[PDB]
């Protein structure tokens, strides 16, 4: 049985969920201008969907929180938008509290208290990909070689993030926990070394990938140190943990994908949030690619037909189902990643994201149950694993894919602003009620 | 909303559900010896699955009834086995009540009373394909041209069924309703004019098809008359209603598939149970096939790639999904069938079966919701439609396919005798509790 202290819940971000009515429109991020760029759209780099026609969590948060509490979840992780809290640059302002948008801060405090009043512990994540436009204009970077506002490449970013973190630890006194950032390794790798992924600014330069990783490491460490001076609540980080299999090059792949960053922040976190979706198959390359510093080294490639590289709504080359976005269902990898984190680090663990793109709900019941069974296996091994948070409660804006990729336990009709739970939502409630997957395991036999 | 007295429930049969424990084993049917025949098995005519290793409804009926009532179902239809009640032939015995197996009768009364005590109305169906071995030995018929026990070909079968019906009407005085038989048109067509279907005795002779139809008509009409002398409860029939589309031969096909039989029993039923799974597409043939009597004329063929003739787990030629047994999901056909029964007859209607073969539960949520939406459309047209029963609550023995086709809202692990609800089960409960499909309809957009 899952301990009754165990947290069952969901994860959300600001940008992908908040917008949808005019009173919440936030044009002030790199991602907003990135997705409205017509040249990007014409090249298929981003979709034509409008984030400002989305799910309206900014005003409908009470409906969303009630969906969570109705099936007994007891935690939610939300993102707050730096671009809303500090709409104007803070450089040169030692104490920026007088230029924070307090209407925005009050609104987030109202969202937090509403969730808490429904029995949800609230984890507030300070940064989830998007950056204030005054800090990052990715079209100026991408198309005009203009680095005056260059995001995590920018020499102001670490300092300005620390100031933002200090303000949040002081002002958001009633959260249950903080995390500084969400998958910083994805921001860096997809932004500067993932040209086919469509993440801003879509540069292709291993040295900038290295710079963005290292500035986010610095930003996290300094943020933890300042926030711990002003809050008693736990402060962690959320990381996109890969699980690489293949020839002997697995170890080098895992070092760059996971352990390089995590080794350098582990001393400055109270818990580690693990985001896991699928595995990756690697094989050694004939040549070594090294950064100019010699500090980053790449000598593997990712093998197509497995993990994130499958055909949509198909099977991997190992015969496992692949979802609406072509990601293989590989539940054992979640246990392998968590055991690696336990072996390397003495640190409480949470699964902070796990889910599937699946509008018809033909993958999510199986994937949810199979991954929770793996989580229960880890608990039986006495691993210090304290919660599981699904991505997500509702369909939302899936970065360059727009609304086409639907991750919710609950379907959203974005035009009619309607929420409709899928059957996997009711199954999650039943698993939470039983506090074990044991009465449900026979369903898994239909997939073997 | 669905009317307050509308019935939501499930349908079962004796042979497909009861056995599983040694104390319930019934070797006294045509279907038992048909499925145990090694030559049939070697030819792929029937599977090698054992009905006597099944779901054990005979002893586990309380568990099955509780699955229904915990979701708020309020009806169940169960089959009684003639072969258990009268294990020995009744010919020449006026009043065979002295040779009925009263321990069997008492056991069925216990099953019925358990369902009633949980809030389920009970419809008892007197015949569901299987016949006593003393009435029908299909191996003697098919392999040895021996018609001494020839089932519905036997002039004798009508009289002995009348006696059985009389005994049941007198004995089972706590049921809510009776039906005489279940899809008699399928027994006749697949038994004597459906050589590839695997149904006993697998003859191929249009004149014996005609004779089996006519004798089941006689048996129903006689049974109704005798039963109504001894019970005030409604007595109906359950019919496999085809929905034929295609060229102008569709009207001839509908006449033989549906109205030939139903026209001849309509004045002797209190309600019509409509069993519907998918549509059929027909096209005129160059030649006319006539029975020797001239009463049956066939001038159409069934077009492959639609309805019951799709590839498994695929799509029809119209792009609609097909399930584990290759049956197209065509929910509009249920409304077309019901409206044509409404137009042709003045008779209360029930949907007595509807479901899908689907172990993974990837089709049933969609199919359940879509067909219930069609039912709700018919209710808005003020049609005298009084209930919907899904096939079925649990996985069971699917005639010549054995256990390989799983129709349950609830998965059965037959070896461990374990029941595990699929997510469509919880969705059904939510729809029943809402008393309308309207809050769920947006789920259908994922399937276009």
């Amino acid at each position: 049985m899952f301990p009754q202290d165990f947290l069952f819940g969901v994860a959300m971000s600001g940008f992908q969920f908040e917008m949808g009515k005019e009173n919440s429109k936030d044009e002030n991020t790199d991602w907003y201008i990135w997705t409205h760029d017509l040249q990007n759209q014409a090249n298929g780099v981003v979709s034509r969907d409008l984030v400002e026609e989305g799910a309206d969590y900014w005003n409908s948060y009470a409906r969303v929180h009630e969906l969570c509490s109705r099936i007994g979840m007891n935690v939610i992780r939300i993102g707050i938008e730096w671009s809303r809290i500090f709409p104007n640059p803070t450089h040169g302002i030692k104490d920026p509290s007088q230029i924070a948008d307090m209407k925005v801060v009050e609104h987030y405090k109202q969202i937090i208290e509403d969730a808490k009043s429904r029995g949800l512990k609230v984890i507030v994540n300070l940064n989830h990909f998007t950056l204030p436009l005054w800090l990052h204009d990715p079209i100026r970077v991408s198309r005009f070689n203009d680095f005056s506002r260059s995001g995590w490449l920018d020499d102001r970013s670490v300092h300005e993030f620390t100031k933002f973190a200090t303000f949040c630890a002081k002002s958001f006194d009633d959260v249950d926990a903080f995390t500084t950032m969400n998958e910083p390794n994805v921001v860096a790798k997809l932004g500067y070394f993932g040209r086919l992924s469509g993440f801003p600014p879509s540069l292709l330069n291993i040295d900038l990938y290295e710079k963005a990783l290292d500035n986010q490491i610095l930003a996290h460490n300094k943020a933890y140190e300042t926030m711990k001076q002003f809050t008693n609540k736990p402060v962690g980080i959320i990381y996109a943990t890969s699980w690489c299999e293949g020839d002997d090059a697995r170890n080098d792949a895992m070092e760059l994908e996971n352990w390089y960053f995590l080794d350098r922040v582990i001393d400055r976190i109270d818990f580690l949030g693990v985001n896991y979706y699928t595995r990756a198959i690697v094989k050694r390359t004939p040549s070594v690619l090294s950064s100019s510093s010699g500090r980053i080294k790449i000598n593997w490639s990712f093998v197509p037909g497995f993990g994130g590289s499958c055909q949509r709504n198909s099977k991997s080359l190992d015969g496992r189902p692949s979802t609406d976005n072509g990601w293989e269902i590989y539940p054992e990898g979640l246990g392998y990643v968590l055991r690696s984190c336990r072996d390397r680090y003495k640190k409480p663990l949470y699964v902070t994201e796990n889910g599937v793109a699946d509008d018809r709900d033909i993958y999510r019941p199986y994937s949810l149950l199979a991954h929770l069974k793996i989580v229960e296996d880890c608990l039986k091994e006495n691993m210090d694993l304290r919660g599981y948070m699904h991505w997500s409660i509702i369909d939302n804006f899936e970065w360059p894919m727009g609304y086409s990729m639907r991750f919710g336990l609950v379907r959203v009709d974005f035009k009619q602003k309607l929420f409709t739970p899928r059957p996997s939502y009711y199954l999650f409630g039943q698993i939470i009620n039983s506090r074990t997957t044991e009465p449900f395991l026979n369903l898994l036999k239909a997939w073997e």
Side-chain angles (χ1 to χ4, degrees), chain A residues 279 305-307 310-311 314-322 328-329:
Chain A
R279 64 164 169 186
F306 304 95
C310 302
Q311 279 198 333
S314 185
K315 288 190 217 253
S316 71
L317 303 195
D318 268 0
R320 291 174 186 261
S322 58
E328 186 186 23
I329 304 171

Side-chain angles (χ1 to χ4, degrees), chain A residues 210-224 226-381:
Chain A
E210 175 182 341
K211 183 198 253 313
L213 279 180
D214 287 348
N215 275 349
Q216 287 179 103
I217 288 165
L218 278 168
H220 166 81
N221 284 329
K222 296 180 165 314
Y224 177 86
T226 187
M227 308 172 60
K228 291 300 263 181
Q229 276 168 39
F230 300 105
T231 179
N232 62 337
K233 286 132 197 321
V235 178
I237 201 173
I238 290 162
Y239 196 87
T241 54
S242 321
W243 179 254
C244 298
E245 298 171 347
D247 63 14
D248 42 44
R250 333 184 155 210
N251 290 358
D252 299 311
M254 287 300 273
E255 169 66 23
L256 182 55
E257 291 279 305
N258 289 0
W259 311 135
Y260 172 86
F261 194 109
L262 284 180
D263 287 351
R264 286 160 182 72
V265 298
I266 204 71
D267 295 334
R268 295 194 164 199
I269 67 169
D270 299 329
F271 59 91
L272 174 59
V274 157
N275 291 2
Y276 172 87
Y277 293 87
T278 191
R279 64 164 169 186
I281 302 296
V282 306
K283 86 169 155 163
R284 186 97 83 210
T285 58
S287 295
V288 177
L289 164 61
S290 323
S291 66
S292 304
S293 70
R295 308 173 60 248
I296 302 308
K297 152 169 189 183
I298 296 167
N299 58 355
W300 65 89
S301 63
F302 292 106
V303 180
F306 304 95
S309 287
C310 302
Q311 279 198 333
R312 274 149 197 223
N313 302 114
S314 185
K315 288 190 217 253
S316 71
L317 303 195
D318 268 0
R320 291 174 186 261
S322 58
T323 60
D324 285 6
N325 65 355
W327 296 352
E328 186 186 23
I329 304 171
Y330 192 71
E332 302 98 299
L334 171 64
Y336 303 148
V337 153
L338 289 167
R339 284 164 200 127
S340 292
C341 290
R342 163 179 202 181
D343 294 359
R344 284 169 146 281
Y345 308 121
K346 175 70 200 142
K347 197 68 62 164
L349 304 172
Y350 294 80
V351 179
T352 39
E353 300 190 19
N354 173 64
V356 291
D358 178 20
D359 190 11
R360 291 161 299 190
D361 211 53
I362 59 163
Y363 307 112
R364 192 171 291 104
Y366 164 60
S367 177
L368 174 71
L369 173 55
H371 283 91
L372 281 176
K373 183 260 183 194
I374 297 303
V375 164
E376 195 164 355
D377 285 350
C378 294
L379 292 170
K380 284 191 216 172
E381 295 158 4

Side-chain angles (χ1 to χ4, degrees), chain A residues 157 176 395 445 447:
Chain A
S157 62
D176 293 283
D395 299 338
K445 280 198 180 179
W447 298 82

